[PDB]
Amino acid sequence: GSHSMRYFYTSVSRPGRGEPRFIAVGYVDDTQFVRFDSDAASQRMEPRAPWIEQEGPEYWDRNTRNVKAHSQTDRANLGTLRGYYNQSEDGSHTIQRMYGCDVGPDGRFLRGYQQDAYDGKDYIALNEDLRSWTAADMAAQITQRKWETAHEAEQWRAYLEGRCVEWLRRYLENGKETLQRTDAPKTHMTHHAVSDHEATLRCWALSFYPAEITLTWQRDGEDQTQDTELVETRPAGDGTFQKWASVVVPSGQEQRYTCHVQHEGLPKPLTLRW
Amino acid sequence: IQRTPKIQVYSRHPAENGKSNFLNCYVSGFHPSDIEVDLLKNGERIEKVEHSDLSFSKDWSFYLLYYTEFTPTEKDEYACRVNHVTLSQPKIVKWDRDM
Amino acid sequence: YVARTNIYY
């Protein structure tokens, strides 16, 4: 199908307890493959999936060098922002950044992203044309002006339309078994009675990959959202995911309710009934 | 603005007594990223507990998986204990085989 | 593959 590769950077300041901390992680789809941690002893980019381990020493050295320069900048960027926003040094603050690219089933560029957040709120983002930026407030306008003069957009464009796309394709090939599978959800339904008048139906999906999935309830074939609960999709720890949806129904009416499971590993959506 | 963690405690595979498994505590949707997570066996902290690398969702909130290997029994109660700036006291979420 | 881009604020 389609595929994506993202890097997620998190920088945090620790006033009164030390210098900032920078953590980077890299994903292909819902599978993590690298990490870097400025607090850790190794000070190298580390493998986090079997299929990246085969990359050679210059791969690891160049990735380490690149992420170390970002680590150093973003750790300094915390002091910059605290000055733009006139924040007291008493406060602990956060810079986040996501960037990466999607490709279609032909392996070719669809879309690329670069988005930054300061304390969980949008700061600056690269627009879809990869040539201009959207600043969120007057502080991020300072950064926008700096980046537009120095022409930093087209370096992002080159990376996002070239190197990102091309190594995503390499990783997709090297980790064929892991990354290009669809593990169909294994489903079942539980039932929990607390009293005589009311029972909870729970629809389960286990062992599925990719993470994208939809569970919906129906009564008599009609959609039903009243009295339903849906938990966050959650990792099993073995590369698959889990999810459930539940509904409270009056006793005796269980038979009318259907759970519906849509996942790209299922040729036809599943239908389950108590 | 700060967002409090959602907590889910659960096993890697369907829990069958005597059969080895992994106990998971997944915390998602929180900001900021500093968080304390411990896994409990009958109220005692479990020692060899690993966790995943810090990452975040499209809405910028963070998620972490804490996990340790374990063998469930009829009698042993497991739980996950979570502290965060948005929580006044550590929240304890017991493991029920049905959530 | 990590990008070699600039991100100073």
Author numbering:
A (entry chain A): 1 to 274
B (entry chain B): 1 to 99
C (entry chain C): 1 to 9
Task: Please give the exact wording used by the authors of the publication that reports this structure.
The structures of HLA-A*2601 complexed to the three 9-mer peptides (i.e., DVM, YVA from HPV, and CVA from SARS-CoV-2) revealed diverse conformations of the binding peptide in the median portion. For the other three peptides, although CVA, DVM, and YVA are all nonapeptides, they show different conformations with residues in P6 or P7 of peptides as the secondary anchors. Actually, peptide YVA in HLA-A*2601 also performs a similar conformation with CVA, while P7-Ile as the secondary anchor. As a result of repulsion between Arg62 and Arg163, Arg62 rotates upward, moving away from the PBG, causing the “open” conformation of pocket A. In the structures of HLA-A*2601 complexed to EVF, CVA, and YVA, the PΩ position is occupied by Tyr, forming hydrogen bonds with residues Asn77, Tyr84, and Lys146 in the HLA.
MHC, also known as HLA in humans, plays a crucial role in orchestrating the immune system recognition and response to viral pathogens. Furthermore, we determined the crystal structures of the HLA-A*2601 complexed to four peptides derived from SARS-CoV-2 and human papillomavirus, with one structure of HLA-A*0101 for comparison.
